[PDB]
From a paper:
Deacylation of Cer to sphingosine and subsequent phosphorylation by sphingosine kinase lead to the formation of sphingosine-1-phosphate (S1P), whose irreversible degradation by S1P lyase (SPL) terminates sphingolipid metabolism. SPL (EC 4.1.2.27) is a pyridoxal 5′-phosphate (PLP)-dependent enzyme bound to the endoplasmic reticulum membrane through an N-terminal sequence, with the catalytic domain facing the cytosol. The active site is formed by residues from both subunits and comprises an Y-shaped channel whose distal part is largely hydrophobic.
To confirm the soundness of our virtual screening campaign, we solved the crystal structures of unbound hSPL and AfuSPL at 1.8 Å and 3.5 Å resolution, respectively. The structure of ligand-free hSPL was superposable with the one solved in complex with a known active site inhibitor with a RMSD of 0.36 Å (between 443 Cα pairs), suggesting that hSPL does not undergo extensive conformational changes upon ligand binding. Access to the active site is guaranteed by a deep cleft flanked by the last two C-terminal helices. The surface of this cleft is highly hydrophobic to accommodate the aliphatic tail of S1P. PLP is bound through a Schiff base linkage with a lysine residue that in the human enzyme complexed with a known inhibitor is Lys359 (internal aldimine). In the visible region, hSPL shows an absorbance maximum centered at 426 nm and a shoulder at about 340 nm, attributable to the ketoenamine and enolimine tautomers of the internal aldimine, respectively. In this regard, the crystal structures of the two proteins in the ligand-free form confirm that the coenzyme binding regions are superimposable, thus further supporting the possibility to develop a dual-species inhibitor. In both enzymes, one of the aromatic thienyl rings of C17 stabilizes the binding by π-stacking with Phe545(A) and Phe565(A) of hSPL and AfuSPL, respectively.
Numbering used by the authors:
A (entry chain B): 106 to 553
B (entry chain A): 111 to 553
Amino acid sequence: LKVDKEYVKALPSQGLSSSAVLEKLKEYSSMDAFWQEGRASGTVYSGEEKLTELLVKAYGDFAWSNPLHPDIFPGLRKIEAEIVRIACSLFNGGPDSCGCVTSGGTESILMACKAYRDLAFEKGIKTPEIVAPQSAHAAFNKAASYFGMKIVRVPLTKMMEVDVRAMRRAISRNTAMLVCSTPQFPHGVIDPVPEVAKLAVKYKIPLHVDACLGGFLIVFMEKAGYPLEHPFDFRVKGVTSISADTHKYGYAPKGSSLVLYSDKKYRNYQFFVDTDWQGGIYASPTIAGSRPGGISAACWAALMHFGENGYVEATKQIIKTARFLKSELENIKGIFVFGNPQLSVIALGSRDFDIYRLSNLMTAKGWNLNQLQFPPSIHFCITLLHARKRVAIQFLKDIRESVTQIMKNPKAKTTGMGAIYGMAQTTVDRNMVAELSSVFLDSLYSTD
Amino acid sequence: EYVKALPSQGLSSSAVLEKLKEYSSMDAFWQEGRASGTVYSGEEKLTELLVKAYGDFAWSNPLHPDIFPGLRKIEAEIVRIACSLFNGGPDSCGCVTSGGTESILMACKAYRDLAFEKGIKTPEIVAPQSAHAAFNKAASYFGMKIVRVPLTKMMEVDVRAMRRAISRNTAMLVCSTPQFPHGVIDPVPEVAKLAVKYKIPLHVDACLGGFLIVFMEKAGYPLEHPFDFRVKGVTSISADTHKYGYAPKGSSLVLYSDKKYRNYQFFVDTDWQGGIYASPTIAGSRPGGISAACWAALMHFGENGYVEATKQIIKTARFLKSELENIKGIFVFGNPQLSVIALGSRDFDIYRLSNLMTAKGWNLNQLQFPPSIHFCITLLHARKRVAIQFLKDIRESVTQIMKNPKAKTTGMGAIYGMAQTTVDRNMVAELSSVFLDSLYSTD
């Protein structure tokens, strides 16, 4: 926002040399130095030098590959097939399971939603509904908005799990899919997949499991020695699709994710086919046409580099860190932890002061946390980066000091960003907030 | 042969890279210049630069502008540069997207929501028959009706037919600069007349042509029609940096004449427990590496670079066009002024020519409705100097075929012809599903 350099607003009359381009780029990259010292929530999952170098070289070897042309790039076609099958194995899908590589968790979610809309249409459902917990990702609303589907969000329990009784009452003759999250992003709580799947089986409704965030942790937890309370994978009868982000705890480059299905019969509905196009018979498996095959190469590289032993070890370290932080953060007067988080995310509240004061303060001390709402809350997401750099001690100390400071003045009005997130929740005119967002989006592209 | 599960033990870097060389052992085909379109430069030094640029921004993600303010600036700049190239002026604006499909999808979604705002229940896209398949995806995904209007003998949209296709439900008009099948530019001024008269948004699909058409005049090859924001009624443009921008795959632009239109493409969830959610495009997390590399390509070529590149492509196109017009047995559809040349034949089955060119080691694009094949000339093709060889092989292929013009088409060539003549569209749809299934096979 406050840039210290003029904007390039047109193409240069004379193209720059390679060295000059890369030297000018240094000015932009030096601006982006907030994550390297382990002070950002989520965002960068490993960021390690030797890993980066491998992933960029792998990308580089496949820079011009485009899986739209599998006759030209059969090697890339085999890499993507292998990525999918590795994932189906990790989720114990067996030989009938299938999937596709996508650009991210959002596309993974949208693809399943679209698949289930088209199946519902085929069964005479005029306006399909998504039935989802309040905590399910925003991408489910985007799918509703994009694909013309009604979305019903059901309330959560005191422990921030979906209320299954309420979910039952939300089901109707028009329900196209059920959703649960492993875990939900806000508070890092795993929904009770078996209980939701019971409904899915009883009412004959597809069930999508959102494992975008947890996928490349939860798959390894048992082997890491941290067993979970609930099963989450294709072994659970009624689970019809899973989303999972390689680009989160797979340590794959950005622009990589999977949508997996229990059966090809489901995946078929996600496909787009135009048999009549002048430009040839056109069939795409996902949203994009042209895609960056380099990213798929690098994603395959991450997986083959970590292996089972690497992801188990990475999981062990993230979970050790999170369990330590969670037990400490439970013994601080003035805050509480929402629910009982078993993975990498911890959400905090305060019954004693405005919790956004803590996000404001920690921002000041060089930390970047996520700011939630409904109810008022903040979270941090623990990554390999955070375990590697051992920021856990300093995080705690800054949390403790901040809380003591706030506590000296518990009713002192809340300022800056914290104020906006507070007031936004109380504003009865939702369009005010919407209009505030559109200004923020515009401001992203500003060159003034 | 197939890796079907995670290795128990991770491979070392070197071992990973050594294994990956197995997958990259077919690139000589494209590298030799034998592939239609597909790779637009491929040039070694350019690749090194773009991969380094990507590498500097590998972990950047524009969902987090506060963390990566450098990427943010980069993307604002790519959009402003592109707006200048299309002479949009200060009120024009745009977004970086993942490719041309997403650019088309975004504009369609923008126009749908604006039509919803005016009480229209099922918004209609009015498009030429030649418009890209992505417009049918848009319709399918977003619940819009697509009306495809016929072409003239020159393969341009029939503008009278297009007017007759307009209804109270029309949300957008489309034309292409050029359309992908025949490489013909639609008469943008004439379509913009309708847009203005009936107050309908108009989207210009410049995904393919974008980073040629903007330089044509300066290359010394003035086009017949104007195409950019200076044309009254053009409300948006899609343009692929990953084609004639020579940018990495994963890179395209959607540009608007005014901010008011772009506001309709955005997604906002103010109520999400995870926080106020506002995304400009389809994706959430995105690869900022690709944007960095897209900026690098723009800054590396500059105006002089792209003018010179455009010169080299069009010289090659105009030569091949004049030569393919002087070959007994074949004709070229319409009058292509850019990088795509489409061939047909009234003397034999055109797919035989694709058969023989495939055997000679060339990969051309097979079209349909009507039976046709095309080549897309890229900067790679010009650097490799393949045009003469290309011509020689076409001539020999035609000469041969013309000895038995009425012989039965075999191979894929037959599939392409049968496909169009089948009465049950379904059977064709199923072959496609089966093809797509096969992409993901590990058997």
